[PDB]
């Protein structure tokens, strides 16, 4: 096999996503060839989670799965496995049995306004916390309190989802971080997916 | 800090439309709700409506369904506010308000903008 | 439609204490605990003295305090003094996602 996995659709794409609406990329049947990840010197985060972040280019996985988001700084954090909070609950969830590696680097200079980038977005309200790897795109109306929100926001009904509104001013904790979630799988299929080794 | 700028006055005959605009600066555009109360001369304050600069969500009051009708503009975070089929009785000014808790509406409105004079008369 | 009531007016002497009271429906201020409280002056937009119906936002200072009683929201201001001439008014939610002003009082320092 031959073929060179699609990182590039991934890693350098124009926009990403928003927080509570990841996209999820499966890559299988290719090559993947770590060294421009691990050895790009512009990534802020390259945290691994059960695997070598160095020797994982010699080792074959089932495949791959890619996953999105732009988030704040600060928040960047929360997307480890165990850890809780705003995002880490309510809009992306990692199992406690992690076996893939974040990756993160701050973009302010593509993805901020002087304005205001009122485009991405985040869960801040929901019923429950979010089961491993589930998504949410549903915009219905958080109900609180004790009378039913039959459907219009109002007193006691609020609107699931917030905006970050990054702007080219605020603190590092406070800017927008592109992030990519890497999981693989070893389980005991035939792995086809797999850098180069001879 | 914040700051809320609203259009200058505004004459118009009976039986027109109005629209006064509020733009936003210096805050999170989207997360405060915003609300539009009226005060005519010498009558007092008058609670309008609410509109929701992140959903685009609005309510009013029974006295102005079928009259008013709010907008957001989040490209330049601005707030419009259209009254049409003006009367004798609608001449007074126009203020904008950002609600204080995030997120939510609970009617508290700290930071209030400068006033907009609308007039109507023949 | 609904209104909340508020004496016509209200005086005090520089020094000492006054009060204000707001009246309503027990749909506007028994049954929630949002009443708020407005200082209008002439020729400057409407500041907000206190909010929920107790707490008091950063600025003001400890002079205001209100509290909420049955159906009757009050606000009393004390250690008056002669910049406090102006229009107060109780804002309350009155359900269905409206919020109502009451009439106002216009608050004279007397001497």
């Known amino acids: 096999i031959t073929n060179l996995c699609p990182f590039g659709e991934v890693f350098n794409a124009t926009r990403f996503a928003s927080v509570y609406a990841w996209n999820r990329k499966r890559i299988s049947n290719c090559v993947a060839d770590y060294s421009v990840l691990y050895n790009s010197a512009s990534f802020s985060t390259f945290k691994c989670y059960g695997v070598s972040p160095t020797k994982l280019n010699d080792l074959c996985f089932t495949n791959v799965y890619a996953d999105s988001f732009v988030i704040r700084g600060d928040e960047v954090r929360q997307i480890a496995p165990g850890q809780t909070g705003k995002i880490a609950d309510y809009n992306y969830k990692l199992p406690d049995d992690f076996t893939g590696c974040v990756i993160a680097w701050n973009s302010n200079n593509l993805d901020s306004k002087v304005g205001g980038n009122y485009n991405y977005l985040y869960r801040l309200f929901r019923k429950s916390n979010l089961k491993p790897f589930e998504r949410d795109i549903s915009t219905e109306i958080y109900q609180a309190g004790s009378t039913p929100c039959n459907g219009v926001e109002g007193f006691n009904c609020y609107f699931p989802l917030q905006s970050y509104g990054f702007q080219p001013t605020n603190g590092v904790g406070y800017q927008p971080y592109r992030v990519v979630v890497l999981s693989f799988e070893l389980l005991h299929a035939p792995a086809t997916v797999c850098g180069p080794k001879k | 800090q914040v700051q809320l700028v609203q259009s200058g006055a505004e004459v118009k005959k009976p039986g027109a439309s109005v629209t006064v605009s509020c733009k936003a600066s210096?805050?999170?555009?989207?997360?405060?709700?915003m609300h539009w109360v009226r005060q005519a001369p010498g009558q007092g304050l008058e609670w309008m409506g609410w509109?929701?600069?992140?959903?685009?969500?609005?309510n009013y009051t029974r006295k102005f369904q079928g009259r008013v009708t709010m907008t957001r503009d989040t490209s330049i975070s601005a707030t419009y506010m259209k009254l049409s089929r003006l009367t004798s009785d609608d001449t007074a000014v126009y203020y904008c308000?950002?609600?204080?808790?995030?997120?939510?509406?609970?009617?508290?409105?700290?930071?209030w903008g400068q006033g907009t004079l609308v007039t109507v008369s023949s | 439609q609904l209104v909340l009531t508020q004496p016509p007016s209200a005086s005090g002497s520089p020094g000492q204490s006054v009060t204000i009271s707001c009246t309503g429906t027990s749909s506007d201020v028994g049954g929630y605990n949002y009443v708020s409280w407005y200082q209008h002056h002439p020729g400057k937009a409407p500041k907000l003295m206190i909010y929920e119906v107790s707490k008091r936002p950063s600025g003001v200072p400890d002079r205001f305090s209100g509290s909420k009683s049955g159906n009757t929201a009050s606000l009393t201001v004390s250690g008056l003094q002669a910049e406090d001439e102006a229009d107060y008014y109780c804002?309350?939610?009155?359900?269905?996602?409206?919020?109502?002003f009451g009439t106002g009082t216009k608050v004279t320092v007397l001497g």
């Open positions: 804002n309350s939610y009155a359900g269905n996602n409206n919020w109502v």
């Open positions: 308000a950002r609600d204080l808790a995030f997120s939510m509406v609970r009617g508290a409105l700290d930071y």
């Open positions: 509109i929701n600069p992140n959903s685009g969500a609005s």
């Open positions: 210096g805050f999170l555009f989207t997360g405060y709700y």
